C-alpha cells in the first residue's frame, strides 16, 4: 500500500520535528547576548589581479596561501602568485564552459569542470615543463557544480543530475555514488578531518554524507529557495548555507537544528558564495548586488561591506592562515582584500 | 631595481603570458556566436547538417566570417541554473517544427507539441538575460505539413481560427502567432524562414541576419539609430 507508506513517512517526519523541538533549550542569541561585538570592519584592496577577459566563475586558494587558481569563460585556467602579481601558469582548456575549479592539497594537480559533464585533472609538475591533461573523469550526466580534492588519488564531484560521486583518479572509475537529493546539487565542502561532507541542492535542503559508508547521515531544511553555497565551520561541527532568498543560515551537526539566520531588509538579491574566516568568528558572503557582506557568526548583526566590483561577485575564498581574502566577480577582475 | 635575477625572469615570463593571453583574446573576440535552442529536438539535426555529451560546438566559416554554434539539447537539466552563461551571445537560433500541430506530446492527455514550442519560445524570448539578443526563427518540416493540413484543418491547435485550409494563409498564421509572443519589439527583432529538406540558402539567410544584427548593434552602440 503506497498510501500506508506515505502515512508512515508523514508520521516519522512529524515525530522527528517533535523530537527536534523538544531538544531545543535556548536560542543562540540568548547565549551570545553578553559577547562583545567585533565592531565595524574596514578592509583594503591590497592586490588587483587582472588578465582575464570574461566572467570569473571559480577560484581556490593554494595550501601555502600564496598561489591561487582561477577559471573564467575565456577557456583559460590561470595560476597566480598572490604576493607578486606574476602569472605562474596559464592552462588552455578544451571546453570554454567552465563553472568550477579546485587546487590539490599537495599542489601537484588542478581540477576543472563545467557544462561538458567531464572533470579534467591537470598535472602541474612534470619533466617536460608544460601543463598537460592528466585525467578526464566522465560518467556524470548533469553539469558539474563543484569538485574538491581529498588526496592525490581521490576526488569528490557533484553534478546537476541530483548526484554526487567519489572518483579514483588512477583507474578513473567511480567508487561511491551518493543519491537522494531531489533538486540539482550546487555546492559541497569537505570536513577539516576529511571524513564527512555536506552537499546543498536545489530542493531547499542540505545533506551530510559519509565518504566511507556512502550513506546519507543527516538532512537539514528550512530554506525557502535554492541553496547556492555551503561551507563547514573550522571546528567541523557546524556549517553555513547561503540561499537565493537573501538569507544565510547556520546549522549544527550535533544539535540537528539551525542556530541563527542572517538577513536584512535592504538586501533582496541572492547569495553566490559563503565562507568562514579563521576561528569562525566572521562570515563573508558574496551577493548579487556587487557587494560582499561580513556578518558575525555569534552576532546576527552586520560588521562591514566590501564594494569594489562593478559586476556580480561569483566566488570568494579565505587563506588557510587567515591572512587575506580573495574575491572574483563576473567582472574580469580578481581582488585581494586585507 | 631591488629584484633578484630569478624575480626578473619570472616577471618576463608573466609579461610573455600576458602577451599570449591578449593575443588569444583579440583573436577570439571577432567570432559570431549562435546558440541553437530547439523545441522537442525536432529538426535540429537537419539544420545542423545543412550548416556543416552535454553541449555540442559546431565551428564553420562563411564569407570570411567564423561562426560558432552551441547546442545544449542534451543537458536535460534546469535551464535557469546555467542560461546566464550564454548572455552576450550574438544570436539565438530557434527551431520550430510545423508538422506536430496534430500530434500530442506523450504522458499528457491533451497538450499539443506546438503549445510546448510556444511556451518555450515565450520563456526564452522574454528572458531577463536575452533582452538584446536577436532570435532567428526556423519553421521547418513544411512539406509533409502541406500534405497533412489537407486531411485535417488547422483548428485543433488554435480554436480561434477561421480561414482556408490550404497551405497559403495557414503557415503564415502560425508564423504570426509565434512572432506575436514578442513583448520587446523596440529592442529586439525576429527573423523567420521556411526551410525545406533540400534547401540550401539557410546558411545565406543566417549570414544575412547576422550581418544585419551586427550593423544594427554597431550603430546602436554609438548612440545613433
Amino acid at each position: 500500500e503506497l498510501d500506508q507508506l506515505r502515512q508512515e513517512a508523514e508520521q516519522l517526519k512529524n515525530q522527528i520535528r517533535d523530537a527536534r523541538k523538544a531538544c531545543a533549550d535556548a536560542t543562540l542569541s540568548q547565549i551570545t547576548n553578553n559577547i562583545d561585538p567585533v565592531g565595524r570592519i574596514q578592509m583594503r584592496t591590497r592586490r588587483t589581479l587582472r588578465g582575464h577577459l570574461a566572467k570569473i566563475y571559480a577560484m581556490h586558494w593554494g595550501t601555502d596561501s600564496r598561489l591561487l587558481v582561477s577559471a573564467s569563460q575565456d577557456g583559460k585556467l590561470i595560476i597566480w602568485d598572490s604576493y607578486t602579481t606574476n602569472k605562474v601558469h596559464a592552462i588552455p582548456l578544451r571546453s570554454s564552459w567552465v563553472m568550477t575549479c579546485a587546487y590539490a592539497p599537495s599542489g601537484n594537480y588542478v581540477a576543472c569542470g563545467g557544462l561538458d559533464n567531464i572533470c579534467s585533472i591537470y598535472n602541474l609538475k612534470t619533466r617536460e615543463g608544460n601543463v598537460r591533461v592528466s585525467r578526464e573523469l566522465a560518467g556524470h550526466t548533469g553539469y558539474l557544480s563543484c569538485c574538491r580534492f581529498l588526496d592525490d588519488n581521490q576526488i569528490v564531484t557533484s553534478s546537476g543530475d541530483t548526484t554526487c560521486a567519489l572518483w579514483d583518479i588512477e583507474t578513473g572509475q567511480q567508487t561511491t555514488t551518493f543519491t537522494g537529493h531531489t533538486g540539482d546539487v550546487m555546492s559541497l565542502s569537505l570536513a577539516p578531518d576529511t571524513r564527512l561532507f555536506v552537499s546543498g541542492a536545489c530542493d531547499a535542503s542540505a545533506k551530510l554524507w559519509d565518504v566511507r559508508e556512502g550513506m546519507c547521515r543527516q538532512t537539514f531544511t528550512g530554506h525557502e529557495s535554492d541553496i547556492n553555497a555551503i561551507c563547514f565551520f573550522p571546528n567541523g561541527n557546524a556549517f553555513a548555507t547561503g540561499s537565493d532568498d537573501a538569507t544565510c543560515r547556520l546549522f549544527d551537526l550535533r544539535a540537528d537544528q539551525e542556530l541563527m539566520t542572517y538577513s536584512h531588509d535592504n538586501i533582496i538579491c541572492g547569495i553566490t558564495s559563503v565562507s568562514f574566516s579563521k576561528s569562525g568568528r566572521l562570515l563573508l558572503a558574496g551577493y548579487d548586488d556587487f557587494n560582499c557582506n561580513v556578518w558575525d557568526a555569534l552576532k546576527a548583526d552586520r560588521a562591514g561591506v566590501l564594494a569594489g566590483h562593478d559586476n556580480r561577485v561569483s566566488c570568494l575564498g579565505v587563506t588557510d592562515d587567515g591572512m587575506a581574502v580573495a574575491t572574483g566577480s563576473w567582472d574580469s577582475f580578481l581582488k585581494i582584500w586585507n | 631595481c631591488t629584484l633578484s635575477a630569478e624575480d626578473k625572469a619570472a616577471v618576463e615570463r608573466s609579461k610573455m603570458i600576458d602577451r599570449n593571453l591578449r593575443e588569444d583574446g583579440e583573436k577570439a573576440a571577432r567570432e559570431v556566436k549562435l546558440l541553437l535552442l530547439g523545441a522537442g529536438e525536432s529538426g535540429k539535426s537537419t539544420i545542423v547538417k545543412q550548416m556543416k555529451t552535454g553541449i555540442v560546438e559546431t565551428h564553420f566559416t562563411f564569407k570570411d566570417l567564423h561562426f560558432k554554434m552551441f547546442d545544449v539539447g542534451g543537458q536535460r537539466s534546469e535551464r535557469k541554473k546555467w542560461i546566464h552563461c550564454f548572455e552576450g551571445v550574438t544570436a539565438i537560433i530557434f527551431c520550430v517544427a510545423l508538422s506536430d500541430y496534430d500530434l500530442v506530446l506523450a504522458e499528457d492527455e491533451e497538450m499539443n507539441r506546438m503549445h510546448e514550442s510556444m511556451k518555450l519560445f515565450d520563456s526564452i524570448c522574454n528572458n531577463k538575460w536575452f533582452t538584446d539578443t536577436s532570435i532567428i526563427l526556423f519553421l521547418n518540416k513544411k512539406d509533409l505539413f502541406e500534405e497533412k493540413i489537407k486531411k485535417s484543418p488547422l483548428t485543433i491547435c488554435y480554436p480561434e481560427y477561421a480561414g482556408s485550409n490550404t497551405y497559403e494563409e495557414a503557415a503564415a498564421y502560425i508564423q504570426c502567432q509565434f512572432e506575436d509572443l514578442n513583448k520587446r519589439k523596440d529592442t529586439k527583432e525576429i527573423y523567420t524562414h521556411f526551410t525545406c529538406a533540400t534547401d540550401t540558402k539557410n546558411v545565406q539567410f543566417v549570414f544575412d541576419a547576422v550581418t544585419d544584427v551586427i550593423i544594427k548593434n554597431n550603430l546602436k552602440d554609438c548612440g545613433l539609430f
Partner: single-chain antibody, 231 residues
Framework: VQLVESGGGLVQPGGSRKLSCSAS????????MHWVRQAPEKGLEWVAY????????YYADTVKGRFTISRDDPKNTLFLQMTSLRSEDTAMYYC??????????????WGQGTTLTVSSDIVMTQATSSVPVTPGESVSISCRSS???????????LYWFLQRPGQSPQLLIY???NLASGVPDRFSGSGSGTAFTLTISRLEAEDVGVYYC?????????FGAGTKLEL
C-alpha cells in the same frame, strides 16, 4: 628529455667556430638556456645565458665582445658562435636548461658537452680539495662566500652540483634546502649567510665525484673550486 651538442675539435688560434645544441623531449621555447665552460684540468665556469624569447642576453666578461649566442624556436636549437679564439678557450662546453617561476628548479638538466682545442664578481672559495673517507660514514663539504647570498624576500641563492668521473654535472640541492627531484634523500644542505655545508649521511659507490657550489644571486654566475671524494 635529452640534449645533444655538436662542434668543437681542433681550431687554429685566431679563427672562428660555431657550436650547436639540439634539444628533444621537452618544450624548448619555455626554457632559458645557458652555456657553461669547464677547463680540462679545472672547475666549471659560466659563459653565457639567453632568456626565453631572446628578451635578455648575458655574457661573461672573459668572452664578451667576441662571442654570440642565439636560439632557434621553430626548430629546437641553440647556437654559440665564437670569434678570435685564443689558447685559453680550449675546454669542455655544456648546454644547460633552466626555467624560472615560483617553485621552479633551474639548472635541472645538463647536456653531454663538446670539446674545443686551441693551439666586482662574487668570489666563492672551497678550502676542501680532497676528503678521503670510507663508505658508510657521514661526510660534510663546506663552501664559503664573500657576500650575503640571502635576499630581502627570504630566498637564498646557493646551488649544489655533483660531477661523477666521465659524466655530466647533476643538480643536487637548489637554494641550499630544496632537494632536487630524482635523487636519494641522503643529501642535505644547511647554512646561513656566508658559509654553507652539504651533508651526506651514508656514502655509496655512486657518490664518488666532485661537488661544486654555485651562486645565482646575480650575474656573472661564479662557480666554486670543487672538492673530490676519494676512497
Amino acid at each position: 628529455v635529452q640534449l645533444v651538442e655538436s662542434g668543437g675539435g681542433l681550431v687554429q688560434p685566431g679563427g672562428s667556430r660555431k657550436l650547436s645544441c639540439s634539444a628533444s623531449g621537452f618544450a624548448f621555447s619555455s626554457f632559458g638556456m645557458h652555456w657553461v665552460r669547464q677547463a680540462p684540468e679545472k672547475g666549471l665556469e659560466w659563459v653565457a645565458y639567453i632568456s626565453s624569447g631572446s628578451g635578455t642576453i648575458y655574457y661573461a666578461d672573459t668572452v664578451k665582445g667576441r662571442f654570440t649566442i642565439s636560439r632557434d624556436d621553430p626548430k629546437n636549437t641553440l647556437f654559440l658562435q665564437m670569434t678570435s679564439l685564443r689558447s685559453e678557450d680550449t675546454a669542455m662546453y655544456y648546454c644547460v636548461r633552466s626555467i624560472y617561476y615560483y617553485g621552479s628548479s633551474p639548472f635541472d638538466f645538463w647536456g653531454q658537452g663538446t670539446t674545443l682545442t686551441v693551439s666586482s664578481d662574487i668570489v666563492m672559495t672551497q678550502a676542501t680539495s680532497s676528503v678521503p673517507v670510507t663508505p658508510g660514514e657521514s661526510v660534510s663539504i663546506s663552501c664559503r662566500s664573500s657576500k650575503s647570498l640571502l635576499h630581502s624576500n627570504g630566498n637564498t641563492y646557493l646551488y649544489w652540483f655533483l660531477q661523477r668521473p666521465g659524466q655530466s654535472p647533476q643538480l643536487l640541492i637548489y637554494r641550499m634546502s630544496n632537494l632536487a627531484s630524482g635523487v636519494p634523500d641522503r643529501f642535505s644542505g644547511s647554512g646561513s649567510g656566508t658559509a654553507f655545508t652539504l651533508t651526506i649521511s651514508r656514502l655509496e659507490a655512486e657518490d664518488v665525484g666532485v661537488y661544486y657550489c654555485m651562486q645565482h644571486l646575480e650575474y656573472p654566475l661564479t662557480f666554486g673550486a670543487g672538492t673530490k671524494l676519494e676512497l
